[PDB]
Design a protein around this ligand. Structure first.
Ligand SMILES: *CCC(=O)Nc1cc(-c2c[nH]c3ncnc(Nc4ccc(CN5C(=O)c6ccccc6C5=O)cc4)c23)ccc1OCCN(C)C
Length: 268
């Protein structure tokens, strides 16, 4: 463990100012990191996890935090600091444009094929990096990609989403890099539908049944057959018949070189 990469923060070195959002795991704040013996105030996001009645040992928490601080890839969020009190607080850079799901919904009529395909490349690059580090994400979804600037996104929320899960994960709790590929395909489908809800109107309890019957998410209107075929391959029942992230990078990078040819958007 490269301990230098993780700042262990005193409570007095950061301040929560605004609420960004609150969830089941915890609450995310916008605030300032004011490191001791520096002369700077750094805007940060601070996620305070809900207090555990039975907390993991701090050595075990820190062991995982060192991994999160070790990630070095433009398309994966990095843990800048941790504060260990009665709660765990995670400090990372602010991503001012929010989550990519909200971003695509809110800008749908101004999003072209180059933007979309670039996001697919960037997410595949981040996931390939996580696979190279032997980390399985388990919850890739458009809601778990954050937008640093409109054309620089990063994966977050790692370290029950039935409608993103590979069938083997639903039925057998099996999580792998290839089940992450299934989730990648669903994420791409979210982007290409400008943030539609997958299997809208189908309860989560019925998802494994419709998947077992061979049904899949439908071809997005803007998607040419080449793009949809890649998505469909991510949802093969045999996990080793799905694309690898390294292949997805290559394929979406080629499509990003000629984006109008692969996506059909009114206005480009
Ligand atoms: C899609 C809806 C949504 O996410 N809303 C939402 C956005 C944000 C948010 C906005 N701007 C942000 N800038 C930075 N960070 C966050 N959120 C955030 C997420 C997760 C963590 C914790 N964390 C990691 O998962 C991780 C991985 C790897 C390395 C480091 C870290 C790490 O620190 C911190 C911050 C931003 C916040 C909250 C939002 O809503 C949350 C509740 N849902 C239910 C809406």
């Amino acid at each position: 463990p490269n301990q230098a990469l993780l700042r262990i923060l005193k409570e007095t070195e950061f301040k929560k100012i605004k609420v960004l959002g609150s969830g089941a795991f915890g609450t995310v704040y916008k605030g300032l990191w004011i490191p001791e013996g520096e002369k700077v105030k750094i805007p940060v996001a601070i996620k305070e996890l809900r207090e555990a009645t039975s907390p993991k040992a701090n050595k075990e928490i820190l062991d995982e935090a060192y991994v999160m601080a070790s990630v070095d890839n433009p398309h994966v969020c990095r843990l800048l600091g941790i504060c260990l009190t009665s709660t765990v607080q995670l400090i990372m850079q602010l991503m001012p444009f929010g989550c990519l799901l909200d971003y695509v919904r809110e800008h749908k009529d101004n999003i072209g094929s180059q933007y979309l395909l670039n996001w697919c490349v960037q997410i595949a690059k981040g996931m390939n990096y996580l696979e190279d580090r032997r980390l399985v994400h388990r919850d890739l979804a458009a809601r778990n990609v954050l937008v640093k600037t409109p054309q620089h996104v990063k994966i977050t929320d790692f370290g029950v989403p039935i409608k993103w899960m590979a069938l083997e994960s639903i039925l057998h709790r099996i999580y792998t890099h290839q089940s992450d590929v299934w989730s990648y395909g669903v994420t791409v489908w979210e982007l290409m539908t400008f943030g539609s809800k997958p299997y809208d109107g189908i309860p989560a309890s019925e998802i494994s049944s419709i998947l077992e019957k061979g049904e899949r998410l439908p071809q997005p209107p803007i998607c040419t057959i080449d793009v949809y075929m890649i998505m469909r391959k991510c949802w093969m029942i045999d996990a080793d018949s799905r694309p690898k992230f390294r292949e997805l990078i290559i394929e979406f990078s080629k499509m990003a070189r000629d984006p109008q040819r692969y996506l059909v958007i009114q206005g480009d």
